[PDB]
Design a protein around this ligand. Structure first.
Ligand SMILES: CCCCCCSC[C@H](NC(=O)CC[C@H]([NH3+])C(=O)O)C(=O)NCC(=O)O
Ligand SMILES: CCCCCCSC[C@H](NC(=O)CC[C@H]([NH3+])C(=O)O)C(=O)NCC(=O)O
Lengths: 239, 239
């Protein structure tokens, strides 16, 4: 009874989805449709009281946080070593990235998607161009840190092989890709890394997991009641 | 040997300090004085190019991020396993808290200190009552989530014993305590939990680690050159 409560629109759900499918981990997929406000229902509030996705249920055990969910599945299903290496220092490099991204690249990628596309297209709320400029400037800074602090001259973020870190980072970078931002343009080292990550994960799986975010621009505007319920949740999300 | 680059004024450094000292981990303490902008010096930039503390140095290996540092020390020095339990679901509970706090409690506790004390006292910069109110209301939301999602009816955040999760949370909560917020007042579940954490950590060590944050209201204001150097760093920290 392993169940993953996911919406492929969100960066953390894509990381969990790709991981579980790549490693042939059997699970029931429960799609929690975020644009319909399904995560705000009483039925989802029973699974996760915080009313957020991804959420994991394994028997009677409930787990939140994509980093925790990824580590739980890594250990329980005994996946290959490269995802979270046995080696003390390689493991630490994975921990370093997973910790760093929460307050930096996660935030920057999220704010890029919402200020450029999901506020004016989906919630019908225009964003000032000064706010959008500042957001994309901050995106540039985090992308530069991704290159200079993590990737540097290596094949992958923490070493010669893909790890949990590369999975979290690539699903994050696809948020502004879906928003139409020039993420990999003029960043050749990131561009070749993306292609290496796509191959390690499986290109077909990569494409499949990113079908929803790549069409975020074509979302019909929200329902006036749905917009009302989602607005404080989104404002607390974007900070 | 092992070197820990710390400033006990900051929440993540206190967590690392308390962990290394409680577990009798031999290290060389390198105080990096934030108030004097020592983290911005060319000498510290060699240790950590990101110019932030805590930073670990163990020979040719350098590590950032307090969560990564705590886990690396956990593993290398074979500390008691209650800090990071071997049981999969208990270890997940620790991972769940460590992941959650980065964008919620860490952020509120850091903003409480800066908007209530460190901007007006140390940097001579007034904060609007509206900004401070917003910050302290968000702190109350995170304190309620700490109680309702994590601590609940248990002795500690993840079960019957202390873990790395309690260490991160207690050092976070002492940031608004040092700013003069009535954190444990009217929250009896948190107040008794604090007493259990202090008892488990050892009261003398707990007090030693918190000597600087409890004196933050009395820091002499920065001169105009130090202020000018620290202001863009502080604004990137306080978004
Ligand atoms: C139509 C879009 C609705 C809102 C945007 C969804 S972004 C995804 C977001 N997920 C989280 O905030 C959990 C983050 C957590 N740190 C993790 O990694 O698991 C969520 O479900 N948040 C939902 C919410 O807070 O309302
Ligand atoms: C009085 C100076 C103001 C410093 C405020 C915060 S001190 C803590 C801060 N450290 C971090 O941002 C690292 C956080 C990281 N997520 C961790 O847990 O280690 C820092 O060294 N920041 C220094 C900087 O960014 O300049």
């Amino acid at each position: 009874g392993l169940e993953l409560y996911l919406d492929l629109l969100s960066q953390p759900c894509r990381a969990v989805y790709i991981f579980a499918k790549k490693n042939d981990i059997p699970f029931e997929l429960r799609i929690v449709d975020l644009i319909k406000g399904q995560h705000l229902s009483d039925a989802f509030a029973q699974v996760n009281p915080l009313k957020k996705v991804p959420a994991l249920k394994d028997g009677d055990f409930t787990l939140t946080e994509s980093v925790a969910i990824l580590l739980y599945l890594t250990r329980k299903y005994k996946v290959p070593d490269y995802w979270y290496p046995q080696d003390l220092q390689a493991r630490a490099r994975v921990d370093e990235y997973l910790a760093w991204q929460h307050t930096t690249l996660r935030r920057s990628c999220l704010r890029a998607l919402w200020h450029k596309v999901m506020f004016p297209v989906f919630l019908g709320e225009p964003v000032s161009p000064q706010t959008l400029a500042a957001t994309l400037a901050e995106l540039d800074v985090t992308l530069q840190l991704l290159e200079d602090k993590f990737l540097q001259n290596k094949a992958f973020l923490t070493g010669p092989h893909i790890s949990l870190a590369d999975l979290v980072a690539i699903t994050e970078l696809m948020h502004p890709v879906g928003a139409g931002c020039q993420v990999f343009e003029g960043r050749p080292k990131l561009a070749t890394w993306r292609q290496r990550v796509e191959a390690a994960v499986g290109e077909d799986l990569f494409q499949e997991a990113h079908e929803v975010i790549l069409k975020a621009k074509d979302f019909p505007p929200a329902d006036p009641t749905i917009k009302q319920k989602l607005m404080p949740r989104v404002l607390a999300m974007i900070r």
